[PDB]
Amino acid sequence: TNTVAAYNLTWKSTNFKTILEWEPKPVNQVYTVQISTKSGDWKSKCFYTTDTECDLTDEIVKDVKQTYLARVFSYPAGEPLYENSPEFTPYLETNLGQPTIQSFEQVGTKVNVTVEDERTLVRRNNTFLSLRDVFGKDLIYTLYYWKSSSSGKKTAKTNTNEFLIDVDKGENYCFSVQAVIPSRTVNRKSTDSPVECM
Amino acid sequence: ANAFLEELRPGSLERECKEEQCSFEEAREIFKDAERTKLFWISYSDGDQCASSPCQNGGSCKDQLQSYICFCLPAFEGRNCETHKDDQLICVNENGGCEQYCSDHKRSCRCHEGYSLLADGVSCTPTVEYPCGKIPILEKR
Amino acid sequence: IVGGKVCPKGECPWQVLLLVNGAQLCGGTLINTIWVVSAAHCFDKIKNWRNLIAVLGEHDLSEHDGDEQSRRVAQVIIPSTYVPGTTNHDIALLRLHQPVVLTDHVVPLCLPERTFSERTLAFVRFSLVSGWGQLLDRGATALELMVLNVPRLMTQDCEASGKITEYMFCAGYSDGSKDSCKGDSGGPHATHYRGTWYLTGIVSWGQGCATVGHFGVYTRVSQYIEWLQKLMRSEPRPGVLLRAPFP
Numbered sequence A: 001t002n003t004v005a006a007y008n009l010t011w012k013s014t015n016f017k018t019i020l021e022w023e024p025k026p027v028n029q030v031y032t033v034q035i036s037t038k039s040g041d042w043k044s045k046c047f048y049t050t051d052t053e054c055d056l057t058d059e060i061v062k063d064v065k066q067t068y069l070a071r072v073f074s075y076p077a078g079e080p081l082y083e084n085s086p087e088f089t090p091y092l093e094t095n096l097g098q099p100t101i102q103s104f105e106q107v108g109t110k111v112n113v114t115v116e117d118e119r120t121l122v123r124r125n126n127t128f129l130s131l132r133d134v135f136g137k138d139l140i141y142t143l144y145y146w147k148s149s150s151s152g153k154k155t156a157k158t159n160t161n162e163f164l165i166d167v168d169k170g171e172n173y174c175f176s177v178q179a180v181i182p183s184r185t186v187n188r189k190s191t192d193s194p195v196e197c198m
Numbered sequence B: 001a002n003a004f005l006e007e008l009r010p011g012s013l014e015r016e017c018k019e020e021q022c023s024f025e026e027a028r029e030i031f032k033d034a035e036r037t038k039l040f041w042i043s044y045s046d047g048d049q050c051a052s053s054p055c056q057n058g059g060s061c062k063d064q065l066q067s068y069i070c071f072c073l074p075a076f077e078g079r080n081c082e083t084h085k086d087d088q089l090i091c092v093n094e095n096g097g098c099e100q101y102c103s104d105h106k107r108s109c110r111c112h113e114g115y116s117l118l119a120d121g122v123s124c125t126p127t128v129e130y131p132c133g134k135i136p137i138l139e140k141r
Numbered sequence C: 001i002v003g004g005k006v007c008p009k010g011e012c013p014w015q016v017l018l019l020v021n022g023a024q025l026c027g028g029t030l031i032n033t034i035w036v037v038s039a040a041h042c043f044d045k046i047k048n049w050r051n052l053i054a055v056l057g058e059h060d061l062s063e064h065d066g067d068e069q070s071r072r073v074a075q076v077i078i079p080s081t082y083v084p085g086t087t088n089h090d091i092a093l094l095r096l097h098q099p100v101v102l103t104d105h106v107v108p109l110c111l112p113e114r115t116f117s118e119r120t121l122a123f124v125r126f127s128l129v130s131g132w133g134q135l136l137d138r139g140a141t142a143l144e145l146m147v148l149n150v151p152r153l154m155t156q157d158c159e160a161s162g163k164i165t166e167y168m169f170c171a172g173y174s175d176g177s178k179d180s181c182k183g184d185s186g187g188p189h190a191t192h193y194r195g196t197w198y199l200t201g202i203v204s205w206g207q208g209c210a211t212v213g214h215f216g217v218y219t220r221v222s223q224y225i226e227w228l229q230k231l232m233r234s235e236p237r238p239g240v241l242l243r244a245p246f247p
C-alpha cells in the first residue's frame, strides 16, 4: 500500500504540558493530528508534519476537566489511514512536576518549610497559573525530614505550601517535599524534590 | 569537591554537592547512612536538562526527572516552542480562517452563490433575500 | 426518525416530501429553486413516473395550512453505477417541472464544494437528520416532521461491527435510541458551520432502526458534487428516469 497506520500512541503530560507521541518515522508519507472532546468538533494540529510528535497543550488547557481524544492521520507523499489514541483527562492524568523547596527557616524548637509554587501551562489571565490554582483542595504536599543521626524518616503534610514541623534542638535536619493528589489512582504522587539541609 | 584541606571542615550538602560537584564518597560523608545516600544519588545523578537551552523564541525551561518542560510565549507552541501560529494559514487549519470556501496557492477565500466576500477577505454575507443554508424565521425581526 | 423531536414549522425549510399516487414515498432536499436531492432506492418500484409529486414547505401531513408548494417531478437522475437492490451510489437528482418560490418556509440547503466538505464539514461532529419516516423499527410513520441530531463516525471506527464504501459514511448512536429509519430515506443530513448549513449526507440504509451495535448509513454527498453540478447544466431528456454516467 501507499501508507501505514501509526501506532504506540502515548500521552506525555507534565504540569498540563501535553505532548502526543507515536510511531514510526515517516517514509513516503506525512502525518496530521486531530483532537476533540467527547462531543466537540475535531480540530487539526501539526498539519502534514514529518515529526512523530505533536504538542496539544494549547488545546487541552482550554478545559483541563474535559476528557480528550485524538488520532493520527497518514497521508502519502476514501478516508486516509489513522489510529486512535487512548482517552486523556488532563486534570486526572497529568504528571505532577518535581517540586522545589523555596526556603526554610527555624525559630527555636520549630522550623518552617516553604515550597515554591509550581507554574503550570494553563495560561489563564495572560499568565501561567500555579499548581494550586488548578487543583485547590485536591493538592497537598508531603514533607520528608530527618536527622543525620535518625534511623528512619519522619513525615508531614500540608494543605498549603508551608510545613510547620517540630525539631530536636541543636540537631541538623534535611528536607524533601513531594506533590500529592490523594484523589488519584494513577499519577498519585510526583517525584521527590532536591534535598535541602540546614 | 575536595580542595586543599577542604576535608578538614565538616561536610555540607550546599558547599560540596550543590555549590560544587560532589562524588558519591563525598555524599556518603554527609549522609553517613548508606541507604539514604543511595536514595540521594539517584535524584542527584539526574542532571539539569535545561543546561542545553532547548527552548526557543524566548521560552523558559524547567528541569524535570529525565526531561524538561518549555513555557512558550503566546504566539508559540511545541516541545521547544519552535512552532509559530501565523505560519500555518492554510485550508486544513480551521478552513484557513475563511467563513466558507478556501483555496491554497496567500490563501484566498470565496463564497457560495447567493453570498459575496466582504472587504476582510474571509467573511461572506447574503446578497439575495433567501440565501441557502439559513432559517428566515430565525434571522428576521 | 427514532427518538427524535418535532421540527418546529419553518426550521427545516429544505425538507422535501415526495409522493406517488398521493401516497408517501420518500424525503428529499431542496438545494435550489429547481433541483432536489434524494435517495435512489426510493425510485426502484415506481411505475407511474407521471404521478410523481414533490411537496415543499410541508410540516403536518394531516392538515393544509397553505404554505405547501407542490411540483411535478420532470426528471429523475441517478448514477449509472447505482444498482437497484443494492446500497452503493444511493443518490438521485430530481428536476422539478417548474421552479418553486422561496419563502420563509421554503429555503434551499447549500451544496458545498468538494474540498470544503472534505476538509471542514466532514469533521463537524453533529448534524441534523429529518423526515416523516417511521418513529420505531417496523412502526407507523410520523405526521409531523421529526428531526434528530447525530454524530458522524469515520469508516474505520464504524467497521468495528467492507460493507461501508467510500461513497458512504456512518452516523448515529450504537445505544439503540436515536436513529433515522424507514421512510426518512432521501432526507437531508445537514451540517452547520459559521451561520450556514450545508448538505453532507443523504438518508440511505441501515441494519434495523436504532439497533444496538450499529449506526445509520448515509450517502457521502461530497463524492457527487461535480457530478450533480454537471447535470444541473445539462439539457433535459424526454424520459423521466435517466441513468447518468458516474463520474
Ligand SMILES: *[C@@H]1O[C@H](CO)[C@@H](O)[C@H](O)[C@H]1O
Residues within 6 Å of the ligand: B048, B049, B050, B051, B052, B053, B054
Ligand atoms: C539540551 O538540549 C537538547 C536539544 O537542544 C535536549 O534534547 C536536551 O534534553 C537538553 O538537555
Ligand SMILES: *[C@@H]1O[C@@H](C)[C@@H](O)[C@@H](O)[C@@H]1O
Residues within 6 Å of the ligand: B058, B059, B060, B061, B071, B072, B073
Ligand atoms: C519565561 O517564560 C516565558 C513564557 C517568557 O515570558 C520568558 O521571557 C520568561 O523568561
Ligand SMILES: C[As](C)(=O)[O-]
Residues within 6 Å of the ligand: C008, C011
Ligand atoms: C428553541 As427552537 C427549536 O424554537 O430554535
Ligand SMILES: C[As](C)(=O)[O-]
Residues within 6 Å of the ligand: C158, C159, C161, C163, C170, C206, C207, C213, C214, C215, C216, C217
Ligand atoms: C450499519 As453497521 C455495518 O455499522 O451495523
Ligand SMILES: [Ca+2]
Residues within 6 Å of the ligand: B001, B002, B003, B006, B015, B016, B020
Ligand atoms: Ca568543597
Ligand SMILES: [Ca+2]
Residues within 6 Å of the ligand: B001, B002, B003, B006, B007, B016, B026
Ligand atoms: Ca569536598
Ligand SMILES: [Ca+2]
Residues within 6 Å of the ligand: B014, B015, B019
Ligand atoms: Ca551556596
Ligand SMILES: [Ca+2]
Residues within 6 Å of the ligand: B001, B015, B016, B019, B020
Ligand atoms: Ca565550592
Ligand SMILES: [Ca+2]
Residues within 6 Å of the ligand: B007, B011, B016, B026, B029
Ligand atoms: Ca567531604
Ligand SMILES: [Ca+2]
Residues within 6 Å of the ligand: B002, B007, B025, B026, B029
Ligand atoms: Ca572526603
Ligand SMILES: [Ca+2]
Residues within 6 Å of the ligand: B046, B047, B048, B049, B063, B064, B065, B066, B067
Ligand atoms: Ca532533571
Ligand SMILES: [Ca+2]
Residues within 6 Å of the ligand: C058, C059, C060, C061, C062, C063, C064, C065, C068
Ligand atoms: Ca401540510
